[PDB]
Design a protein around this ligand. Structure first.
Ligand SMILES: Cc1ncc(C)n2nc(CN(C)c3nc(-c4ccccc4)nn3C)nc12
Ligand SMILES: [Mg+2]
Ligand SMILES: [Zn+2]
Length: 312
């Protein structure tokens, strides 16, 4: 059969958490199929259906600065790394569902936060009162799965199919950062009181949610030059939102105001300390082989501190 292979540098470095998928768009589908084959098997999906699914997913990502097809694939690679370093903890259905969830988790993203959609009074804010974009991303995932020749799950039973779509829904909902704070707090408590129990479905859900946040934030876990250039894409979306807030007659919060670039370094410190570090710390406590993500994050916090001290 037809094993996808990569050049030697990619074959070795794709196994590492800090891997950057590179600027050759045309290689990213192949990078994804390689990861499915190694974390799932050559059998998980029919190649022709999987290829057709990947290509319609790509088409449904938009040409925005950060929440684009490259982000999709980047987030899926981080899930691949977590799965490969924790071979025996995940069911075959989770292996399958999680890479698809990550490839799909920001489908048809327009570059604007849930909060901007609510203030603009976007139709999606009326259809989905919370996790507005994330409910949209899951809705777009089901759509594509229902196109002719795109059902990559069609060898599963009614009930395996329902389970896998339910893993994908929860995984995508979990990428709403508003929900991450309480999820991590609960997991911190369950880890520390010793009640964390991976046979408890509602515990597993919490642990997959945190993995989803970890993958989603994974630019903070790269080599500093990747982290730093990705930060420019992130703020290029936020500042456009800032502009659109000003057009609605609303002074945007400082992290979205282009006239306050000054405050970016300090806004990065808050983000690493309030969000990223706590995220990878709890993750590393529950899944110890994910420690390199926490180590790379702390490395990047220390680079932002150097930027503040004018050494960078
Ligand atoms: C590198 C990176 N990856 C992903 C995202 C989503 N962001 N967000 C920023 C900076 N910034 C715009 C931001 N700070 C906070 C925050 C700060 C302190 C406390 C709570 C929340 N939320 N947000 C969206 N940097 C990143
Ligand atoms: Mg998202
Ligand atoms: Zn995302």
């Amino acid at each position: 059969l037809m094993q996808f292979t990569l050049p030697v540098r990619l074959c070795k470095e794709i196994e590492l958490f800090h891997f950057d998928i590179g600027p050759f768009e045309n290689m990213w589908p192949g990078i994804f199929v390689y990861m499915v084959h190694r974390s799932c098997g050559t059998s998980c999906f029919e190649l022709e259906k999987l290829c057709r699914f990947i290509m319609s997913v790509k088409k449904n990502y938009r040409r925005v600065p950060y929440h684009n097809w490259k982000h999709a694939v980047t987030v899926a690679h981080c899930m691949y790394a977590i799965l490969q370093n924790n071979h025996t903890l995940f069911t075959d259905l989770e292996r399958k569902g999680l890479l698809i969830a990550c490839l799909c988790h920001d489908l048809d993203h327009r570059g604007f936060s849930n909060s901007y959609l609510q203030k603009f009074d976007h139709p999606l804010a009326a259809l989905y009162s919370t996790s507005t974009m994330e409910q949209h991303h899951f809705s777009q995932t089901v759509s594509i799965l229902q196109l002719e020749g795109h059902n990559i799950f069609s060898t599963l039973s009614s009930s395996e199919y329902e389970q896998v779509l339910e893993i994908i829904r929860k995984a995508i909902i979990a990428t709403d950062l508003a929900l991450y704070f309480g999820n991590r707090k609960q997991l911190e408590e369950m880890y520390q009181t010793g009640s964390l129990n991976l046979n408890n479905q509602s515990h597993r859900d919490r642990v997959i949610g945190l993995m989803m946040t970890a993958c989603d934030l994974c630019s903070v876990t790269k080599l500093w030059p990747v982290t730093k250039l990705t930060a420019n894409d992130i703020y290029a979306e936020f500042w456009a939102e800032g502009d659109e807030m000003k057009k609605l007659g609303i002074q945007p919060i400082p992290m979205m105001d282009r006239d306050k670039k000054d405050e970016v370094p300090q806004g990065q410190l808050g983000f690493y300390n309030a969000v990223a570090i706590p995220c990878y710390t709890t993750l590393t406590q529950i899944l110890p082989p994910t420690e390199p993500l926490l180590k790379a994050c702390r490395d990047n916090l220390s680079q932002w501190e150097k930027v503040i001290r004018g050494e960078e």
